[PDB]
Amino acid sequence: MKVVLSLGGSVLSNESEKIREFAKTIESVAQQNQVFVVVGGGKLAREYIKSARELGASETFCDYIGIAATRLNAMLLISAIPSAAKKVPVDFMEAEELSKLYRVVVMGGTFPGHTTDATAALLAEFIKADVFINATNVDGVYSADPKSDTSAVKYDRLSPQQLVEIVSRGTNVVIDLLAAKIIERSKIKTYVILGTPENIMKAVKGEAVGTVIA
Amino acid sequence: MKVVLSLGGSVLSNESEKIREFAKTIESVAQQNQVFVVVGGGKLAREYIKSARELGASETFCDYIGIAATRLNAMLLISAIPSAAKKVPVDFMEAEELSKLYRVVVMGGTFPGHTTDATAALLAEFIKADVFINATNVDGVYSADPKSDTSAVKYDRLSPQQLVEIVSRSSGTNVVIDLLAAKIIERSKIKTYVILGTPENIMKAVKGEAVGTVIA
Amino acid sequence: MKVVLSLGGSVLSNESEKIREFAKTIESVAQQNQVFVVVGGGKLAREYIKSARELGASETFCDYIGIAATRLNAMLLISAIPSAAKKVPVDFMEAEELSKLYRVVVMGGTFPGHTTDATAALLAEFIKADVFINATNVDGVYSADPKSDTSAVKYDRLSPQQLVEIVSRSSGTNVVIDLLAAKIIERSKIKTYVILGTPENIMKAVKGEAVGTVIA
Amino acid sequence: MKVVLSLGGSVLSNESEKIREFAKTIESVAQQNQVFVVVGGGKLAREYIKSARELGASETFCDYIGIAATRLNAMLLISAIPSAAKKVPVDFMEAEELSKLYRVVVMGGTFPGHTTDATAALLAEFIKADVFINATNVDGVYSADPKSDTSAVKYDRLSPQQLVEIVSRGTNVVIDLLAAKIIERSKIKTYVILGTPENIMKAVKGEAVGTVIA
Prior knowledge:
Distance between the termini of chain A: 16 Å
Number of domains of chain A: 1
CATH class of chain A: Alpha Beta
Subunit structure (chains A, D): Homohexamer.
Function (chains A, D): Catalyzes the reversible phosphorylation of UMP to UDP.
Number of helices of chain A: 8
Number of strands of chain A: 7
Radius of gyration of chain A: 16 Å
Strand order of the largest sheet of chain A: 3-2-1-4-6-7-5
CATH architecture of chain A: 3-Layer(aba) Sandwich
Oligomer: homotetramer
CATH superfamily of chain A: Acetylglutamate kinase-like
GO molecular function, one term (chains A, D): UMP kinase activity
Largest interface: A-C, 28 and 27 residues
Subcellular location (chains A, D): Cytoplasm
Largest sheet of chain A: 7 strands, mixed
CATH topology of chain A: Carbamate kinase
Helix content of chain A: 40-55%
Strand content of chain A: 5-15%
Structural class of chain A: alpha/beta
Order of helices and strands of chain A: EHEHHHEHEEHHEHE
Shape of chain A: globular
Catalytic activity (chains A, D): UMP + ATP = UDP + ADP
């Protein structure tokens, strides 16, 4: 009922119809429940940090650029969902404050550090979330020897401790180590899924999608 | 084992890391098998045709610019995969010729007409492909109309004839696959996939699993 | 000596080297003088507003996204110039406050309304600027209508009142400078330039020379 | 009367109205005379080579990508000019062949090597051009201590030999050394100018713009 959804980089980079698709799902879940959405920087952030590093930015300043970019993507998503707070919170208190007036709150990053997965895990904990749904571009958590290679299946369920070990332990991560550690501390039922309207809906409805962690 | 992969527009528009991610998958599949890749115009083509129309191009000339663009994207992808033919074929005979010396061939468009899905369907048929993997930005083929709800969903498998019917009635999330592509798939009787184009799904589709919409 | 520079949309959309080229010029001007820079939304804003409108945003909310975008471009530019305030000011008081600690201040938009030219004209007036340099993608202010021939040309100098008249009649290559910008320039009586935004021209305009259209 | 025009990188990167502006001028010059146009890679080439290097391309392959990109920009320009050969020549013979049927020929690069200025200088020589107009983003050739800095004026005229010395001897070049050497050999009246419809027209009409070299 208290959902933290995490939309990573790649997972909806500025395509009008796909964004409409995601928002519609989020709106649906919001009719029944209380949704927090953390968007990531996507192409936008990657691009700009790249360019900003190229121009000789401090890592801290890069960090700011990144957050900015997340906030922008977040704005874009908010356009699409009418029940969302039109304000992009800049911290969790703000995010929770807004949760008292709105069924959907949508934020980018906060602290200039580790990102999105970790950020949303922190948020889930902070607000005592019912379910942390981490919508990524892969289907779940995958074996030692992961990736898009041949020696690979996902784990349909996992313990926190298992997940920690698995990421303790290119290209994209996914789930961050600190995110996992945070999930272990928080004892919050997590999903790691292929981020599509259907799967998100399924995860909300407490079913077998991707990798359940509890 | 003979794979035709289709990477459409949107599906990797010039992001260094994402391209590295796609190449690495294609290279993996190429270690075991024989891969053809057909890239589309993406932002680049859309952008350039848009501008070219704005300046008063003939549709035929827009067509050329489009192919141009596809070929450029294709070159970009080839940088990333070391086992690819450094030539971008300009026709299927070339594409097949190159397939005899390389495990990966990557091409843009050919005939100035219907595109990418159809082009790659044609290529599959031409070379008698084992599997046509159509990596799009949606998850599979979708239901009646369609529009976003729970009772609207993808079809986990389909017959060619079914798929034809599905994209024979519209004129609309089913903006992918093309009608002529589907017709071509029906004629060719080649096992097709319609999937969300990610390295994982592509790998899964190669390994003959449940992804998106399987068509056979 | 107090320079307001205006970099509009198009004028440096995220190309690493071109940005390095602009920064280096701004840093040069900053060695001797006091520089304010107002960047615009470019592709980024156009793109995002386009998408945001498509999704059914209020115009006010589009406005915010636009400002957002400008601010992001501005951040990008700041990476490039080491003598700039690492904060992007969100209003002119901030912008002037920061001008007391830094030789270069770089800002996006402020009020959700008319943009960049007007914004920078306002800023010039606010801080009593010595020179407002409006670096656009055209060469100066242009003649009757206008349309491309030899007898249609730029005006090498102008009075404020003249400029007002020139952009008081249209409703169209004179899509730059804004009407309110011109009105503001007239009120402020601040020496303005309207130029093709290149490092050379900017440097020339700073050094008080014949570039584009001088307005005084 | 036989004009080689050189449009570099930056000088018209895909803006519909500015491209219309350039084409209109080129069309005008073509009413009276015989125009060759060499376009460069601009953002497009820079971007793609960047990405292609990033992905581990050979320098030769980069070279091809670059030419491709030039050819594309060239296509775009041709749309805008009706009296142009709809074919983008891939070599000078082709380029001259087409000159026999068309008043405007527009090409990208040819040999995978030094570029645009040099390419167009070569072309001018090859076809015995009347005037090589090199439309750049700076106003002319500038002093020892050039660039957008304070110790700088342009040279309103120059000898070939002078120009060679000057570039013998960031950021953008401009005029290439080999281009200058080629201009010296060819003894072809050259212009180095700020690439705008007006200046191009002026240069064609044999007037004082930028840096004349003869």
